[PDB]
Amino acid sequence: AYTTFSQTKNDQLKEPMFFGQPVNVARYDQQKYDIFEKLIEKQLSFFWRPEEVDVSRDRIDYQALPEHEKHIFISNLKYQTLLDSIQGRSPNVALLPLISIPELETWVETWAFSETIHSRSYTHIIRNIVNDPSVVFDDIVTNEQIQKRAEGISSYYDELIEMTSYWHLLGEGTHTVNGKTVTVSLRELKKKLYLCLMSVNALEAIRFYVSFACSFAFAERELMEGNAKIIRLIARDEALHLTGTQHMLNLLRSGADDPEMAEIAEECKQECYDLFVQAAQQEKDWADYLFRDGSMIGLNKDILCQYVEYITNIRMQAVGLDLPFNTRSNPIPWINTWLV
Amino acid sequence: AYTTFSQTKNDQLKEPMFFGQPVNVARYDQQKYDIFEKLIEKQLSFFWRPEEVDVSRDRIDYQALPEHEKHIFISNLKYQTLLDSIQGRSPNVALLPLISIPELETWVETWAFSETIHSRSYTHIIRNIVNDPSVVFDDIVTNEQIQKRAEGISSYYDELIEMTSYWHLLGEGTHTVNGKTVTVSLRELKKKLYLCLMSVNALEAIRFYVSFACSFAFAERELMEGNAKIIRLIARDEALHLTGTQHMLNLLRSGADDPEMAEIAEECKQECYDLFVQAAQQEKDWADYLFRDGSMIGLNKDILCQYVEYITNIRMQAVGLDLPFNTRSNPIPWINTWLV
Ligand SMILES: [Fe+2]
Ligand SMILES: [Fe+2]
Ligand SMILES: [Fe+2]
Ligand SMILES: [Fe+2]
Ligand SMILES: [Hg+2]
Ligand SMILES: [Hg+2]
Ligand SMILES: [Hg+2]
Ligand SMILES: [Hg+2]
Ligand SMILES: [Hg+2]
Ligand SMILES: [Hg+2]
Ligand SMILES: [Hg+2]
Ligand SMILES: [Hg+2]
Ligand SMILES: [Hg+2]
Ligand SMILES: [Hg+2]
Ligand SMILES: [Hg+2]
Ligand SMILES: [Hg+2]
Ligand SMILES: [Hg+2]
Structure with a gap:
């Protein structure tokens, strides 16, 4: 029932964001929701190329680092690489077949595209710091500590796609x-999409930002400055991606788009909340494997753990969820030098 | 069975282009086929912003055009808008789920992204030469002559996706x-993919170039200079896209990739030929509508037909097919200055 060009002439301003008639004409002179057109334009204005960043000194910096710090840096880089590997393809394969308005379709493709640039940047960094890049890339697919998260993220996408x-x-x-009964419910598919979007929002709002803290902690000591310049550019892209997922989620629950979705948003409010906490907990448990052999200047299990609760509280409130942690000010305001 | 991140650690250099294990890690330090990495880098170096191109004088030129010339110009633009609307979403929805090597996966996403920029440029043009863009965009869907010319494109994609x-x-x-018997043959799916690629190749190599000639025929008389600048940039991208499809097809035919694809290519030889001949006929049949209210000096049904036969022979030759038409020299050598 999916088509690359719906032959029905429809009003694209009256379609819901998802599950309506597939998009035919790609036009940008008008939109149901201006935010997505604004996001596309901003992302295009931010276009950058990894190769343009000098990472010639990151090699020596990395070599001079104590073994436990090399571990912290590389483990974090491997996780970032994994996240963008999934994000470069998943929005397209999972969301594209369900979008019903042109601005969102193109935003999703633009967003996915910007993630492939991030992936290209990680290869640029990795090949300029290890000698044998293959060791790093293989450990990404099989690293037990990492694969738990990938599995959970890939799962939501895989199930929605199915x-x-x-x-x-x-x-x-x-x-x-x-010989088996197969029940297909649009209401359940809508729930699937909603929870998947919430999961991507958490990936955007929390998973990435926790990784930024680790990357910039090195920058603060004037180490891995090539990497820091690249992460700063990626962080600027992620801020737009998170803005996009927050608007999608809030538009769906405000009852503005599809009434049935607003209904579902309220229905799984508790599930959504636990989904977020779970994500925060995963990043926390990770800080354990990270500083298993020691910490470093500016970062340790406790500070990182505090940043997770801080960021999570902000993100969850941004999408109308109750706060799961004790409120406090930013544990590491120095990070603002590198973010927005 | 499709997954956004396969957990099996596989040697990506040994997977086939299509139908192997879905790609997990996105890496660019090595590739089975260097040509796709070269294409990605080229497309990235060609990045351009349409709204930056000045089309303020195009409004004056267009209005100054006699009605039949407005018909020619706008009909051609409407077809281009359709082709890129389909090409912005189709490669991602139809090919992405079947690719098994990272360089090809990223090329497809980059290729599709460049098509959204093309769509964005048509909006920039349309919005600056007509009072109500909605009349143009709405006619793209309903216009029977435009859908007859494009007949078969979305159909192939939709069948492959299903x-x-x-x-x-x-x-x-x-x-x-x-209660119905449904047969799922991988060989039949490989055939569907192969013919879909051959169809995209014809779309890229013929359908787009026939439209370029019509656009540039106006630039030749110093009119629609803004549109011409845009079409030149678009043509530069399409040349990369067709290079990509020609390489995919020729690699498959060689037997160096999936040996089964080499067999299929050989067996489907006549079908490949038939679709190129069909596409050529559709482009010629379009002339009746394009010039219904009159033609232009140097641009009429006869010249368009001569050009179609000219380019079709060239394109079919590049992928190893026999030539349907009698050989002839370029009937419109003035296009060379506008292309590449
Ligand atoms: Fe990213
Ligand atoms: Fe992102
Ligand atoms: Fe295009
Ligand atoms: Fe193209
Ligand atoms: Hg999702
Ligand atoms: Hg998801
Ligand atoms: Hg970290
Ligand atoms: Hg951190
Ligand atoms: Hg929920
Ligand atoms: Hg919720
Ligand atoms: Hg804490
Ligand atoms: Hg195709
Ligand atoms: Hg196709
Ligand atoms: Hg034409
Ligand atoms: Hg033409
Ligand atoms: Hg063939
Ligand atoms: Hg002819």
Whole structure:
């Protein structure tokens, strides 16, 4: 039931963000929600190329680092690489088949594209600091400490993609496939999409920012300055990506877009809350594996843990969820030098 | 069965271009086919912003055009808008789920992203030469002559996408879906993909160039200078895209990739030929509508048909197919200065 060009002439200003008629004409002279056009323009204005950044000194900096610090830096870089590997392809494969307005479709493609630039930047960094890049890349797929998160993230996407395929092929109803009953509910697919968006928002709002803290902690000591310059550019892109997911989520719950979605937003309010806490908890547990052999100037298990609660509280409130942690001011305001 | 991050550690240099293990880590330090990394780098170096191009005088020129010339200009633009609307989302939805090497996955996303920029440029042009863009955009969907010319494009993609979903959900074999027998053959899916690529190649190599000639015929008389600047940048991108498709097809035919694809290419030889001949005929049939209210000096049905036969022979030759048309010299050598 999916088509690359719906032959029905429809009003793209009246379609819901998702599940409406697939988009036909890509036009940008008008939009249901201006924010997505603004985000596309900003992202295009931010276009940068990794190769332009000098990372010639990061090699020696990395070599001079104590072993536990090399571990902290590389483990963090591997996680960033993993996140953008998934983000460069998933928004496209998972969201594109369900978007019903042109500005969001193009925003999703632009967003995914900017992530491939990030992936290209990580290769640029990695090849200029280790001699044998292959060791680093393989450890990304099999690192036990890392794969727990990837699995959980990939899962939401994989499940939504699967349910979408069934919906497009069979439509709503109770069907039979090779002797098994297969139930396809649009309401459940909508719930799937909502929770997946919330998960991507957490990936954007928390997972990445916790990794930025680690990267910039090195920059503060004037180490790995090539890497810092690249992460600063990536962080500027992520701020836009998070702005996009926050608007999608708030538009869906404010009842402005699809009434049934506003309904669902309220329905799984508790589940959404636990999803967020879980993510915060994962980044916390990670700080354990990170500083297993020691800490460093500006960063340690406790400070990092405090930043997680701080950032999580802000992000959750931004999407209308209750705060899970004790309120406090920023534990590491020095990071603002590198962020927004 | 599709996954956004396969957990199996595989040697990406040994996977086939399509139908192997979905890509997990996005790395660019090595590649099975260097040509795709070269294409990504080239496309990135060609990055341009449409709204930066000055089209303020285009409004004056257009209005000054006799009605039939306005018809020619706007009809051609509407077709280009359609092709890029489809090409901005199709490579991602149809190809991404089937790619198994990172360089190709990123090339497809980069290629699709460049098409969204093309769509953005058409809005920039349309919005600056007509009072109500909605009349132009709405006609793209309903116009029977535009849909007859483009007939078969979205159809191929939609069929591939549907067959792909069946494959990811059910796997190979014969199944029973709602009491009906559904056969899922990987070989048949490979055939579908192969012919889809050959169709995209014809779209990139012929359909777009026929439209460039019409656009540049105006630049030739010093009119629509803004549009001409844009079309030149767009043509520069399309040349990369067609290079990419020609390489994909020729690599598959060589047997150096999936040996089964080499067999399929050889077996589907006549179908490849038939679709190029069909695409050529569709472009010629378009002339009747393009010049219904009159033609222009140096631009008429006869010249368009001569050019179509000229470029078709060149394109079919590049992918190893026999030539359908009698050989001839370029009927419009003035285009060379505008292209590449
Ligand atoms: Fe990123
Ligand atoms: Fe991002
Ligand atoms: Fe294009
Ligand atoms: Fe193209
Ligand atoms: Hg998602
Ligand atoms: Hg998700
Ligand atoms: Hg970290
Ligand atoms: Hg951190
Ligand atoms: Hg929820
Ligand atoms: Hg919620
Ligand atoms: Hg804490
Ligand atoms: Hg295709
Ligand atoms: Hg196709
Ligand atoms: Hg034309
Ligand atoms: Hg033409
Ligand atoms: Hg062929
Ligand atoms: Hg001819």
